[PDB]
Design an enzyme around this catalytic site. Structure first.
Site, PDB file in Angstrom:
ATOM      1  N   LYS A 265      -7.801  -2.607   9.847  1.00 28.26           N
ATOM      2  CA  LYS A 265      -7.775  -1.284   9.228  1.00 28.26           C
ATOM      3  C   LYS A 265      -7.973  -1.364   7.714  1.00 28.26           C
TER       4      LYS A 265
ATOM      5  N   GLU B 298      -7.480   8.537   0.699  1.00 23.34           N
ATOM      6  CA  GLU B 298      -6.236   7.769   0.551  1.00 23.34           C
ATOM      7  C   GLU B 298      -6.218   7.022  -0.784  1.00 23.34           C
TER       8      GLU B 298
ATOM      9  N   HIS C 209       0.588   0.999  -4.840  1.00 25.59           N
ATOM     10  CA  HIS C 209       0.028   2.088  -4.045  1.00 25.59           C
ATOM     11  C   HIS C 209       0.799   3.393  -4.252  1.00 25.59           C
TER      12      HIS C 209
ATOM     13  N   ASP D 161     -23.128   6.779   9.923  1.00 21.91           N
ATOM     14  CA  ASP D 161     -22.211   7.118  11.005  1.00 21.91           C
ATOM     15  C   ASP D 161     -21.054   6.120  10.965  1.00 21.91           C
TER      16      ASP D 161
HETATM   17  C1  LIG Z   1      -3.169  -0.659  -6.977  1.00 17.97           C
HETATM   18  C2  LIG Z   1      -3.291  -1.915  -7.853  1.00 17.97           C
HETATM   19  C3  LIG Z   1      -4.761  -2.124  -8.227  1.00 17.97           C
HETATM   20  C4  LIG Z   1      -2.452  -1.656  -9.127  1.00 17.97           C
HETATM   21  O1  LIG Z   1      -2.929  -2.539 -10.125  1.00 17.97           O
HETATM   22  P1  LIG Z   1      -1.843  -3.516 -10.965  1.00 17.97           P
HETATM   23  O2  LIG Z   1      -1.141  -4.480 -10.026  1.00 17.97           O
HETATM   24  O3  LIG Z   1      -0.845  -2.626 -11.696  1.00 17.97           O
HETATM   25  O4  LIG Z   1      -2.789  -4.425 -11.990  1.00 17.97           O
HETATM   26  P2  LIG Z   1      -3.665  -3.933 -13.326  1.00 17.97           P
HETATM   27  O5  LIG Z   1      -3.081  -2.687 -13.960  1.00 17.97           O
HETATM   28  O6  LIG Z   1      -3.609  -5.137 -14.252  1.00 17.97           O
HETATM   29  O7  LIG Z   1      -5.252  -3.648 -12.978  1.00 17.97           O
HETATM   30  C5  LIG Z   1      -6.069  -4.750 -12.674  1.00 17.97           C
HETATM   31  C6  LIG Z   1      -7.392  -4.199 -12.146  1.00 17.97           C
HETATM   32  O8  LIG Z   1      -7.210  -3.488 -11.061  1.00 17.97           O
HETATM   33  C7  LIG Z   1      -8.222  -2.193 -11.152  1.00 17.97           C
HETATM   34  N1  LIG Z   1      -7.407  -1.044 -11.198  1.00 17.97           N
HETATM   35  C8  LIG Z   1      -6.068  -1.077 -11.281  1.00 17.97           C
HETATM   36  N2  LIG Z   1      -5.617   0.187 -11.310  1.00 17.97           N
HETATM   37  C9  LIG Z   1      -6.685   1.008 -11.252  1.00 17.97           C
HETATM   38  C10 LIG Z   1      -6.802   2.388 -11.253  1.00 17.97           C
HETATM   39  N3  LIG Z   1      -5.865   3.497 -11.303  1.00 17.97           N
HETATM   40  N4  LIG Z   1      -8.005   2.954 -11.173  1.00 17.97           N
HETATM   41  C11 LIG Z   1      -9.126   2.192 -11.104  1.00 17.97           C
HETATM   42  N5  LIG Z   1      -9.014   0.841 -11.112  1.00 17.97           N
HETATM   43  C12 LIG Z   1      -7.794   0.252 -11.183  1.00 17.97           C
HETATM   44  C13 LIG Z   1      -8.917  -2.345 -12.291  1.00 17.97           C
HETATM   45  O9  LIG Z   1     -10.157  -3.108 -12.053  1.00 17.97           O
HETATM   46  C14 LIG Z   1      -7.998  -3.189 -13.196  1.00 17.97           C
HETATM   47  O10 LIG Z   1      -8.707  -3.899 -14.058  1.00 17.97           O
HETATM   48  P3  LIG Z   1      -8.572  -3.603 -15.664  1.00 17.97           P
HETATM   49  O11 LIG Z   1      -7.545  -4.573 -16.220  1.00 17.97           O
HETATM   50  O12 LIG Z   1      -9.961  -3.792 -16.284  1.00 17.97           O
HETATM   51  O13 LIG Z   1      -8.100  -2.188 -15.967  1.00 17.97           O
HETATM   52  C15 LIG Z   1      -2.761  -3.210  -7.189  1.00 17.97           C
HETATM   53  O14 LIG Z   1      -1.408  -3.090  -6.998  1.00 17.97           O
HETATM   54  C16 LIG Z   1      -3.404  -3.416  -5.811  1.00 17.97           C
HETATM   55  O15 LIG Z   1      -4.476  -3.928  -5.677  1.00 17.97           O
HETATM   56  N6  LIG Z   1      -2.631  -2.960  -4.634  1.00 17.97           N
HETATM   57  C17 LIG Z   1      -3.203  -3.115  -3.306  1.00 17.97           C
HETATM   58  C18 LIG Z   1      -3.556  -1.664  -2.919  1.00 17.97           C
HETATM   59  C19 LIG Z   1      -4.237  -1.631  -1.549  1.00 17.97           C
HETATM   60  O16 LIG Z   1      -4.586  -2.618  -0.998  1.00 17.97           O
HETATM   61  N7  LIG Z   1      -4.452  -0.308  -0.973  1.00 17.97           N
HETATM   62  C20 LIG Z   1      -5.074  -0.058   0.321  1.00 17.97           C
HETATM   63  C21 LIG Z   1      -4.455   1.291   0.663  1.00 17.97           C
HETATM   64  S1  LIG Z   1      -2.647   1.020   0.662  1.00 17.97           S
HETATM   65  N1  LIG Z   2      -2.466   0.807   7.415  1.00 18.26           N
HETATM   66  C1  LIG Z   2      -2.134   2.252   7.280  1.00 18.26           C
HETATM   67  O1  LIG Z   2      -2.352   3.079   8.119  1.00 18.26           O
HETATM   68  C2  LIG Z   2      -1.469   2.700   5.950  1.00 18.26           C
HETATM   69  C3  LIG Z   2      -0.733   1.796   5.207  1.00 18.26           C
HETATM   70  C4  LIG Z   2      -0.171   2.200   4.028  1.00 18.26           C
HETATM   71  C5  LIG Z   2      -0.343   3.538   3.613  1.00 18.26           C
HETATM   72  N2  LIG Z   2      -1.063   4.440   4.358  1.00 18.26           N
HETATM   73  C6  LIG Z   2      -1.155   5.716   3.915  1.00 18.26           C
HETATM   74  O2  LIG Z   2       0.183   6.404   4.096  1.00 18.26           O
HETATM   75  C7  LIG Z   2      -0.066   7.696   4.041  1.00 18.26           C
HETATM   76  C8  LIG Z   2       0.790   8.511   5.005  1.00 18.26           C
HETATM   77  O3  LIG Z   2       2.125   8.109   4.810  1.00 18.26           O
HETATM   78  P1  LIG Z   2       3.312   9.142   5.250  1.00 18.26           P
HETATM   79  O4  LIG Z   2       2.913   9.742   6.580  1.00 18.26           O
HETATM   80  O5  LIG Z   2       4.676   8.436   5.335  1.00 18.26           O
HETATM   81  O6  LIG Z   2       3.278  10.360   4.150  1.00 18.26           O
HETATM   82  P2  LIG Z   2       3.981  10.459   2.643  1.00 18.26           P
HETATM   83  O7  LIG Z   2       4.473   9.136   2.145  1.00 18.26           O
HETATM   84  O8  LIG Z   2       3.004  11.047   1.644  1.00 18.26           O
HETATM   85  O9  LIG Z   2       5.239  11.466   2.894  1.00 18.26           O
HETATM   86  C9  LIG Z   2       6.205  10.947   3.793  1.00 18.26           C
HETATM   87  C10 LIG Z   2       7.576  11.522   3.315  1.00 18.26           C
HETATM   88  O10 LIG Z   2       7.365  13.041   3.496  1.00 18.26           O
HETATM   89  C11 LIG Z   2       8.795  13.558   3.694  1.00 18.26           C
HETATM   90  N3  LIG Z   2       8.713  14.668   4.705  1.00 18.26           N
HETATM   91  C12 LIG Z   2       8.784  15.931   4.243  1.00 18.26           C
HETATM   92  N4  LIG Z   2       8.708  16.741   5.322  1.00 18.26           N
HETATM   93  C13 LIG Z   2       8.577  15.968   6.434  1.00 18.26           C
HETATM   94  C14 LIG Z   2       8.451  16.271   7.788  1.00 18.26           C
HETATM   95  N5  LIG Z   2       8.423  17.568   8.481  1.00 18.26           N
HETATM   96  N6  LIG Z   2       8.340  15.299   8.692  1.00 18.26           N
HETATM   97  C15 LIG Z   2       8.341  13.994   8.295  1.00 18.26           C
HETATM   98  N7  LIG Z   2       8.468  13.687   6.969  1.00 18.26           N
HETATM   99  C16 LIG Z   2       8.580  14.680   6.052  1.00 18.26           C
HETATM  100  C17 LIG Z   2       9.495  12.567   4.116  1.00 18.26           C
HETATM  101  O11 LIG Z   2      10.655  12.343   3.244  1.00 18.26           O
HETATM  102  C18 LIG Z   2       8.527  11.210   4.088  1.00 18.26           C
HETATM  103  O12 LIG Z   2       9.257  10.062   3.537  1.00 18.26           O
HETATM  104  C19 LIG Z   2      -1.675   7.858   4.380  1.00 18.26           C
HETATM  105  O13 LIG Z   2      -2.282   8.269   3.079  1.00 18.26           O
HETATM  106  C20 LIG Z   2      -2.059   6.718   4.761  1.00 18.26           C
HETATM  107  O14 LIG Z   2      -3.526   6.498   4.446  1.00 18.26           O
HETATM  108  C21 LIG Z   2      -1.639   4.036   5.531  1.00 18.26           C
HETATM  109  C1  LIG Z   3      -2.408  -1.965   3.267  1.00 14.92           C
HETATM  110  C2  LIG Z   3      -3.130  -1.677   4.592  1.00 14.92           C
HETATM  111  O1  LIG Z   3      -2.170  -1.304   5.549  1.00 14.92           O
HETATM  112  C3  LIG Z   3      -4.164  -0.547   4.415  1.00 14.92           C
HETATM  113  C4  LIG Z   3      -3.489   0.760   4.019  1.00 14.92           C
HETATM  114  O2  LIG Z   3      -4.298   1.869   4.319  1.00 14.92           O
HETATM  115  C5  LIG Z   3      -3.905  -2.893   5.097  1.00 14.92           C
HETATM  116  C6  LIG Z   3      -3.072  -4.116   5.501  1.00 14.92           C
HETATM  117  O3  LIG Z   3      -1.873  -4.032   5.891  1.00 14.92           O
HETATM  118  O4  LIG Z   3      -3.615  -5.242   5.452  1.00 14.92           O
HETATM  119  C1  LIG Z   4     -23.854   9.267  23.276  1.00 14.22           C
HETATM  120  C2  LIG Z   4     -22.896   8.344  22.509  1.00 14.22           C
HETATM  121  O1  LIG Z   4     -23.525   7.114  22.247  1.00 14.22           O
HETATM  122  C3  LIG Z   4     -22.494   8.989  21.174  1.00 14.22           C
HETATM  123  C4  LIG Z   4     -23.671   8.989  20.185  1.00 14.22           C
HETATM  124  O2  LIG Z   4     -23.209   9.217  18.870  1.00 14.22           O
HETATM  125  C5  LIG Z   4     -21.629   8.112  23.343  1.00 14.22           C
HETATM  126  C6  LIG Z   4     -21.877   7.330  24.634  1.00 14.22           C
HETATM  127  O3  LIG Z   4     -22.934   6.640  24.809  1.00 14.22           O
HETATM  128  O4  LIG Z   4     -20.985   7.376  25.539  1.00 14.22           O
END
Ligand SMILES: CC(C)(COP(=O)(O)OP(=O)(O)OC[C@H]1O[C@@H](n2cnc3c(N)ncnc32)[C@H](O)[C@@H]1OP(=O)(O)O)[C@@H](O)C(=O)NCCC(=O)NCCS
Ligand SMILES: NC(=O)c1ccc[n+]([C@@H]2O[C@H](COP(=O)([O-])OP(=O)(O)OC[C@H]3O[C@@H](n4cnc5c(N)ncnc54)[C@H](O)[C@@H]3O)[C@@H](O)[C@H]2O)c1
Ligand SMILES: C[C@@](O)(CCO)CC(=O)[O-]
Ligand SMILES: C[C@@](O)(CCO)CC(=O)[O-]
EC number: 1.1.1.88
Lengths: 378, 421
Positions: free
Chosen positions: B266, B82, B380, B282
């Site tokens: 999560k 992701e 993101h 694991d």
């Molecule tokens: C994604 C995110 C890092 C984008 O960064 P931004 O807001 O545009 O800020 P910046 O470009 O100034 O980057 C600041 C730091 O973040 C890190 N970083 C940002 N983008 C990065 C990228 N593509 N790759 C690696 N590191 C990155 C770097 O440490 C960067 O430091 P730097 O100034 O030395 O390059 C920021 O929006 C964020 O943290 N979002 C939350 C994302 C999240 O929680 N995801 C969970 C799954 S949704």
């Molecule tokens: N806390 C969480 O679980 C969390 C939070 C933020 C992001 N994510 C990340 O979001 C991602 C998944 O997001 P997503 O499922 O919306 O995918 P996505 O954003 O990559 O694509 C979704 C879009 O696909 C299009 N689409 C095309 N064909 C479709 C079809 N048959 N059915 C439904 N939509 C179709 C739709 O326009 C939809 O807006 C994961 O990578 C996941 O890790 C997870």
């Molecule tokens: C961005 C988040 O949903 C994780 C995305 O994979 C976590 C949160 O909502 O705190």
């Molecule tokens: C055997 C078990 O521990 C899985 C081990 O990876 C599950 C269970 O105890 O029900």
């Protein structure tokens, strides 16, 4: 017409296994070569998937045999590091075959998106003002995904919950309820939630904070059933009836003791998470929905149920949230995720979800059977 | 010593990233060759790890930058599918660095082995019979693993719980409390549980059923702390003071609403699980222990805490179970699990567990800071723009051009990549 029984599969070479799989499914040569040579995920693809990439990391890719889902045979790809999982899945699937296989069903693919609103002087009143104007809010969310709506999905409803007692004041939380069709849906509903928050703010008069899906996806439940007869469970030391009683004993243990439930449910995810990985889905989302649902009562309990029916047969169920996708995230992007999906034959994301809970149920059954039949040392 | 800032790492190619990493750690050419080439996990090893193997399956292998644990810089490998995770963790480690980095500690590596006893009409009495003979039970568990005792571990204690009214009748559960040193612990404690089962049977006169570890590893805790100042959190739209208040609002939301806490937690395991995977550990065991611990109070809540200290700074904690191993199956067998450990520099499982909670805390902070400012979607979805291109009907190689356009217009939606196409 698929036959998923795969005799002697456990003893063939990986190449002969790959060979056999391709014969049964009609896999093309391009498809077979994806697993015949290491490196099916090119670095060009991997570098775009996550950040700071320096390489790739392999886990084994396996296929569980014998599974049968509402009468249709299915082959199940699985990716994991831990031994015994694939075997136990396959053996319990084989026992399940004699009594109809697994029976599954699922809800529509509905995800919640939360919109959190602070600073409202009258949040209970504002909730009703919000609900009264939900069609306007639903229409606004659906404008941002014309594609989703054309395919039969989109925002369907809104619910509003309130939290009067909070250290940071009272909180109103709207839930967009969204049909996400074949996606897992996170980004889809997050966009919707970000899109509707200003109108929502205008109605309620608070300040919006979080706009974000909930991983407790309790409107996206998947269900599996399995039945096992005493004859099937008889071991050298125990009658089949005594094995069934021991499984029920282990189930009631999980049901009262969170120390056991955590391990019991871990065994379920031993079966589910490898399928999630193999199809390119987010396994943290599946884990969080699984375990949060197990304690929705306030008591961390067992996700499965195990009972003895009126015939004396062992019957198990698994119902849980199961957000998965055929599209979105990395499921289109990873070549082997696409191949996993071809192997399964699934045509909707909910069909994948029903397979997931079938495999989770089978893993839990295999775990408890082994634990219940292990004699005492002396 | 090592400097984990990795300047411009985000924009280097994977090969140049790998060369820089190799230079910093003094890795050998053979070491670097394991990531510069596909197939570090040979099929004969893969085929011996699990059953019915037909191939292998790759996930990307990344390094997060800027992390610093108790004053020492650390490079953190991560395996996940992701986008945004690695960038957010690196970003938040970067901020943490200015105020001392992450401060961590952990308890001894103690796991429970459960021994369930049925078939007694007097489980409450039988519990006292067990506690009366606990030294004899502990001593018998410790002859079963004499090496572990020489390494500084072993059975330290037992506890005994009763569930005298269950649907299947009364039930007694003994817990062995075992120090497992550098192992996750499952096989160590399971063996010990089997060893004591006939002695417990003789003491209580019941029938032993399950002999099994518990994954609710609440005596194996790891702890991380982080501190962030308001100046670091300011944006063009928001004062850093307002961001800290928005983060506290987000934390209180997770504390009262399980629909939020599930997502909040999560986001923590977005950070922890990829490190578990990268080290051959694991990840199901870590997830089960994490989420079950989050509900121990009877209400499912947040694993982290977030507060404002008396200087107005944002302070965060993560304390949770963290059962991981440096030994144990896949960790020694997978060449890249061994390389990950070498990159981490950890000498005990507990050092690795402390890195995990630092990463999880950083991850949770990153999600919340985005959520409380411009929303999760801006940063993101930009990094997700290629997957949106592929989904909307690109693939081939027009993936780069429509993903570029999606990010210029700050509108990374399928509707937009479709109309661009
Ligand atoms: C994604 C995110 C890092 C984008 O960064 P931004 O807001 O545009 O800020 P910046 O470009 O100034 O980057 C600041 C730091 O973040 C890190 N970083 C940002 N983008 C990065 C990228 N593509 N790759 C690696 N590191 C990155 C770097 O440490 C960067 O430091 P730097 O100034 O030395 O390059 C920021 O929006 C964020 O943290 N979002 C939350 C994302 C999240 O929680 N995801 C969970 C799954 S949704
Ligand atoms: N806390 C969480 O679980 C969390 C939070 C933020 C992001 N994510 C990340 O979001 C991602 C998944 O997001 P997503 O499922 O919306 O995918 P996505 O954003 O990559 O694509 C979704 C879009 O696909 C299009 N689409 C095309 N064909 C479709 C079809 N048959 N059915 C439904 N939509 C179709 C739709 O326009 C939809 O807006 C994961 O990578 C996941 O890790 C997870
Ligand atoms: C961005 C988040 O949903 C994780 C995305 O994979 C976590 C949160 O909502 O705190
Ligand atoms: C055997 C078990 O521990 C899985 C081990 O990876 C599950 C269970 O105890 O029900």
């Amino acid at each position: 017409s698929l036959d998923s029984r795969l005799p002697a599969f456990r003893n063939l070479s990986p190449a002969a296994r790959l060979d056999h799989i391709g014969q049964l499914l009609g896999l093309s040569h391009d498809d077979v070569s994806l697993l015949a040579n290491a490196g099916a995920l090119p670095m060009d693809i991997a570098n775009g998937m996550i950040e700071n990439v320096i390489g790739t990391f392999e886990l084994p890719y396996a296929v569980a045999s014998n599974f049968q889902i509402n009468g249709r045979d299915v082959l199940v790809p699985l990716v994991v590091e831990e031994p015994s999982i694939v075997a136990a899945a396959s053996y319990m699937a084989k026992l399940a075959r004699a009594n109809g296989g697994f029976t599954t069903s699922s809800s529509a693919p509905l995800m919640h998106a939360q919109v959190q609103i602070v600073g409202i002087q009258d949040p209970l009143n504002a909730r009703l003002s919000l609900l009264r104007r939900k069609d306007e809010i639903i229409e606004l969310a659906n404008r941002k995904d014309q594609l989703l709506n054309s395919l039969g999905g989109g925002c369907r409803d809104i619910e509003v919950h309130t939290f009067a007692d909070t250290p940071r004041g009272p909180m109103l939380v709207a839930h967009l309820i969204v049909d996400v069709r074949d996606a897992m849906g996170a980004n889809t509903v997050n966009t919707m939630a970000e899109a509707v928050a200003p109108l929502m703010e205008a109605i309620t008069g608070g300040q919006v904070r979080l706009r974000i899906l909930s991983n407790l996806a309790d409107l996206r439940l998947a269900r599996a059933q399995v039945r096992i007869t005493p004859q099937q469970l008889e071991t050298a030391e125990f009658s089949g009836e005594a094995v069934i009683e021991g499984i029920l004993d282990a189930y009631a243990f999980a049901a009262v003791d969170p120390y056991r439930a955590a391990t019991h449910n871990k065994g379920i995810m031993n079966g589910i998470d490898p399928l999630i990985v193999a199809t390119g889905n987010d396994w943290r989302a599946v884990e969080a929905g699984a375990h949060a649902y197990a304690c929705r009562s306030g008591h961390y309990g067992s996700l499965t149920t195990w009972e003895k029916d009126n015939n004396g047969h062992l019957v198990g169920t698994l119902e849980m949230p199961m957000p998965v996708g055929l599209v979105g995230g990395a499921t289109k992007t990873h070549p082997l995720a696409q191949l996993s999906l071809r192997i399964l034959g699934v045509k909707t994301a909910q069909a994948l979800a029903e397979i997931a809970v079938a495999v989770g149920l089978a893993q839990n059954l295999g775990a408890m059977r082994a634990l219940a039949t292990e004699g005492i040392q002396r």
